Ligand SMILES: O=P(O)(O)CP(=O)(O)O[C@H]1O[C@H](COP(=O)(O)O)[C@@H](O)[C@H]1O
């Protein structure tokens with residue numbers, strides 16, 4: 001019910017650079033969505049610095065212990081790099097020696113051997129889990145141990161409206177692999193941010209979207 | 217004959233993390249080289265932050281005006297990202313809105329359209345110019361204008377010892393494309409750094425390598 005400042009700052013910038021837009025949008029399924037998100041619109045030096053900061057503070061706050069930050073090619077490659085750097089810049093002693101790595105689409109791993117290292121997978125978004133599945137395969141081949149994942153925005157929507165469990169995409173992954181799926185923000189945070197920027201009618205109607213499709 | 221502090225700091229870290237090593241090494245040609253360089257050993261969060269800083273200060277000092285920083289896949293992708301961020305962090309107002317882009321090995325450009333933008337190509341190293349050639353092709357297809365390139369270490373060696381011109385690899389490129397090829401350091405800087413860390417005999421013998429193969 002409160003937003004951390006890093007989450008405020010992220011969301012403010014996402015809306016200003018138009019990475020986050022509000023309106024009527026259809027997903028692949030065909031489901032109405034009241035917003036569109038494209039992390040790729042964090043595309044300047046100022047914006048990428050801000051994004052790095054946001055991911056790094058999310059990570060620091062989670063208290064996850066890891067050795068390597070891994071980005072799935074291609075979009076995870078820059079995110080892994082800029083985040084690794086920011087963690088060493090803002091995280092103190094414990095984050096100086098974190099490594100990054102990523103895969104060539106076709107060894108396959110660019111970086112120090114992953115053997116016996118604890119890996120945090122970073123990416124932009126997750127839906128069906130195909131990039132997470134591929135990273136797990138590549139990482140487990142190199143004898144790494146995945147301890148977590150992080151994405152920018154957790155849509156916090158049920159994968160299906162017939163699933164009784166009502167697992168979201170990040171929940172699905174989290175269950176299957178037994179690891180946390182962190183995010184900078186979720187749908188709930190976007191809603192809290194909008195308090196007093198939108199009308200009561202608009203507030204209602206988004207707080208109703210949360211009801212029909214919100215996970216669990 | 218003086219080293220900027222950023223160049224000192226770079227070289228100190230390169231030697232400590234073993235990205236730069238001294239000894240006897242053979243190139244592909246077969247030529248003796250008195251060192252080995254592997255930028256990929258800047259592989260921690262602290263080291264990548266330092267590398268970002270080094271490239272960004274080199275760029276700032278050059279006074280080159282550009283709009284986009286472009287990294288050739290794969291190794292240029294993280295370098296472009298971390299450098300773009302650092303430029304916005306340390307460069308002031310003029311560097312806030314710089315964009316980055318890079319190519320998929322197989323559109324091909326990830327980032328905002330390059331049409332009418334001034335591009336700085338960033339990579340780790342250059343020898344025959346194959347990655348520069350490929351970037352020029354991709355960039356000129358997208359109507360971008362390349363205004364420069366930067367690499368980490370300029371080996372400052374003649375490509376061939378039969379060429380009368382005695383052009384180095386970066387010089388060759390610079391001539392063919394009509395653009396500056398910047399670097400964080402060159403062979404001359406490595407030599408200046410070593411003053412008083414190595415013996416007179418070792419100083420002589422490296423200052424002799426400079427004579428037989430040093431460009432121009
Ligand atoms: O990162 P690219 O080189 O652009 C390839 P792709 O578009 O597959 O990548 C996107 O989808 C992935 C999500 O997978 P899923 O939606 O099945 O969870 C995630 O990695 C995004 O970058």
Ligand SMILES: O=P(O)(O)CP(=O)(O)O[C@H]1O[C@H](COP(=O)(O)O)[C@@H](O)[C@H]1O
Nearest residue numbers: 289290291339341342343344345346347
């Ligand atoms: O960057 P990678 O995905 O590892 C591919 P590659 O090894 O071709 O890349 C290396 O060579 C390029 C130099 O080219 P030349 O030596 O002909 O000037 C430069 O881009 C390096 O990253």
Ligand SMILES: [Mg+2]
Nearest residue numbers: 073074075131
């Ligand atoms: Mg991806």
Ligand SMILES: [Mg+2]
Nearest residue numbers: 289290291347
């Ligand atoms: Mg390359």
